[PDB]
């Protein structure tokens, strides 16, 4: 099992010196060349060196040259890339590759920071598609490259992968739908049918002559919208130990075509406390999350399911895609415990005088443990019907009686206090053969 | 266990920049991403992006892209979010969440959450309103024109808990926010026992102690 694995990497104050280690595994690299190609922030790949252990032949970028020092010990089978008085533009992630002149092998590289002629040129820049989708990026070559020409792909947090080489040929476990081709100069990437795992970064690199180049890079990305999860219901209302369904639809598939795998997450959320995650890969239960909590579905559509519901599932869950950037989430689905009909209790409370010393007057209606949450408070003042000034609070469900409590304050300035003298709420709920209304008249 | 421990709480004013820390342990840390996920009252869940813990480069959600930007200092295993020219709209919740590349990917195991509250407001504690009593009584307590949130409210020091209803914040015109908690308890007793609410406003450390005797 080649393994490429680098080491060394840190912050480096500016004109510093550092020294990184390529660790090869499954292989020995007095057998091959090693590389060095390192990564700015929001960059292309660059080649900065390169070694062969054998007889220590050395190959370094222009860029480079003499700051830069590429070493190796086949004793050790590790290469090594010395470096000094580093530069601000030195900072990038550097991996080391190995060459059948393709860059077969990537470490996962490692992060260098320094606290402070052969042209490819690909087209496009940038690139949306769809799943489905055929695509071509091309690259053309600046000069005769006869067939010295491979195709990576990159995506974000991780190395490249060799995808083509010799410009035509399938690199082993390459799936069927890529394919390169040569026209000259003109090389051509083409993808058959975009599948959900190909959104990602494509570089171009030929591997004719020495240095290596490579293409500036394609991004693909999902066209149009970002892929879009639509939750329903949109609340839920089921009765104690009773099975509570939620459905989410995604805009497109969360099915990765070489894995089989739904990239799909299902989360609990609920007031003051961080999202709780409840199913990954759209059916595998988080260890610790209760029994009754299961998640099904598949492709686009996927089902969360509670078998019997608690009073402490009470809670908004959340659907989530993490199969492409951006990771979205679902609108979500407010779940909420199933009781009988239970009439309000209405208290009316008149501004204290306390508070008509700060010069505005607060009147408040409470309505008291009722079920369900539709609730129509009105104020009247000297049975005038009023409407403008009224905000309205209400408490979570109440874990043992299933109810909730709304508070509804009618705001007025003191002076408009003093003006009238009877002051009522007249509240309208399920539980109320008719409106019920509570006065006073200070 | 892994764990992820965010900075407190936050207070800006519209136009600052705020910097929200995330430290991690229990795990290697340069082999997860570090994903920031934010809640605005009434928005959901919303992913502004994730950091590779070991490259320190971001994928960013273009709903915010040159607004956040993250960073990470592996030499303390901390992650951190940066939000610049903040506006009321970024009032919220933001979590710090690892996710991981090799094998699982999901966002497992978050933080705690930092509240950030943008607004011209300062911070100042709450007014304490008696709400006199009205088979069943209620009563209650006005604790309004405080920022930023929270504040917590119990009755008799924590020895009367049954029937009482807390009701959330509500942000006034103002910008200060208030709140109402109410209790029920019985007539007869209104007499007998005696009703104190304690308010405690640790973001500017006031701490009130109120009756509600008969009006």
């Known amino acids: 099992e080649v393994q490429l694995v680098e080491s060394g990497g840190g912050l480096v104050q500016p004109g510093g010196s550092l020294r990184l280690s390529c660790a090869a595994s499954g292989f020995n690299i007095k057998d091959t060349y090693i590389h060095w190609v390192r990564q700015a922030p929001g960059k292309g790949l660059e080649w900065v060196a390169r070694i062969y252990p054998t007889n220590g032949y050395t190959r370094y970028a222009d860029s480079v040259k003499g700051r830069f020092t590429i070493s190796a010990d086949t004793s050790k089978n590790t290469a090594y890339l010395q470096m000094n008085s580093l530069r601000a533009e030195d900072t990038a992630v550097y991996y080391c590759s190995r060459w059948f002149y393709a860059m077969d092998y990537w470490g996962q590289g490692t992060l260098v920071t320094v606290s402070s002629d052969i042209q490819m040129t690909q087209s496009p820049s940038s690139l949306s598609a769809s799943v489905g989708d055929r695509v071509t990026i091309t690259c053309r070559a600046s000069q005769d490259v006869n067939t010295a020409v491979a195709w990576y792909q990159q995506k974000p947090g991780k190395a490249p992968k060799l995808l083509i080489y010799s410009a035509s040929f399938l690199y082993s476990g390459v799936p069927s739908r890529f394919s390169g081709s040569r026209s000259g100069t003109d090389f051509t990437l083409t993808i058959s049918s975009l599948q959900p795992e190909d959104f990602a970064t494509y570089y171009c690199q030929q591997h004719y002559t020495t240095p290596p180049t490579f293409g500036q890079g394609t991004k693909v990305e999902i066209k149009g919208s970002d892929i879009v999860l639509t939750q329903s219901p949109d609340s839920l209302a089921v009765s104690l130990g009773e099975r509570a369904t939620i459905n989410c639809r995604s805009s497109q598939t969360l099915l990765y075509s070489n894995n089989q795998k739904n990239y799909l997450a299902w989360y609990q959320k609920k007031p003051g406390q961080p999202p709780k995650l409840l199913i990954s890969?759209?059916?595998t239960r988080k260890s610790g999350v209760p029994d009754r909590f299961s998640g099904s579905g598949s492709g686009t559509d996927f089902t969360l399911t509670i078998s019997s519901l608690q009073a402490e599932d009470v809670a908004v869950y959340y659907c989530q895609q993490y199969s492409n950037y951006p990771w979205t989430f679902g609108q979500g689905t407010k779940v909420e415990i199933k009781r009988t009909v239970a009439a309000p209790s209405v208290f009316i409370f008149p501004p204290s005088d306390e508070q008509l010393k700060s010069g505005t007057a607060s009147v408040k209606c409470l309505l008291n443990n009722f079920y369900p949450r539709e609730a129509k408070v009105q104020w009247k003042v000297d049975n005038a019907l009023q409407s403008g000034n009224s905000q309205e609070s209400v408490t979570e469900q109440d874990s043992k009686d299933s109810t909730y409590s709304l508070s509804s304050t009618l705001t007025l300035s003191k002076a408009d206090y003093e003006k009238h003298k009877v002051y009522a709420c007249e509240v309208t709920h399920q539980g109320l053969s008719s409106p019920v209304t509570k006065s006073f008249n200070r | 266990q892994v764990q992820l421990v965010q900075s407190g709480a936050e207070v800006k004013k519209p136009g600052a920049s705020v910097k929200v820390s995330c430290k991690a342990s229990g795990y290697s840390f340069t082999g997860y991403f570090i994903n920031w996920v934010r809640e605005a009252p009434g928005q959901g869940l919303e992913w502004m992006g994730h950091?590779?813990?070991?490259?320190?480069?971001?994928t960013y959600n273009q709903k915010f892209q040159g607004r956040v930007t993250f960073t990470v200092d592996t030499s303390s295993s901390t992650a951190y979010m940066e939000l610049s020219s903040l506006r009321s709209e970024d009032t919220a919740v933001y979590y710090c969440?690892?996710?991981?590349?090799?094998?699982?990917?999901?966002?497992?195991?978050w933080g705690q959450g930092t509240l950030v509250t943008v607004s011209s407001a300062s911070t100042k504690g709450p007014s304490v309103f008696p709400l006199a009593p009205s088979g069943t009584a209620a009563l209650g307590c006005l604790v309004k024109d405080y920022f930023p949130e929270p504040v917590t409210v119990s009755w008799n020091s924590g020895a009367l808990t049954s029937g009482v209803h807390t009701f959330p914040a509500v942000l006034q015109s103002s910008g200060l926010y208030s709140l109402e908690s109410v209790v029920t308890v019985p007539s007869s007793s209104l007499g007998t026992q005696t009703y104190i609410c304690n308010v405690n406003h640790k973001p500017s450390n006031t701490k009130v102690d109120k009756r509600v005797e008969p009006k």
């Open positions: 890969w759209a059916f």
């Open positions: 950091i590779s813990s070991s490259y320190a480069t971001s």
């Open positions: 969440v690892r996710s991981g590349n090799y094998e699982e990917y999901a966002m497992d195991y």
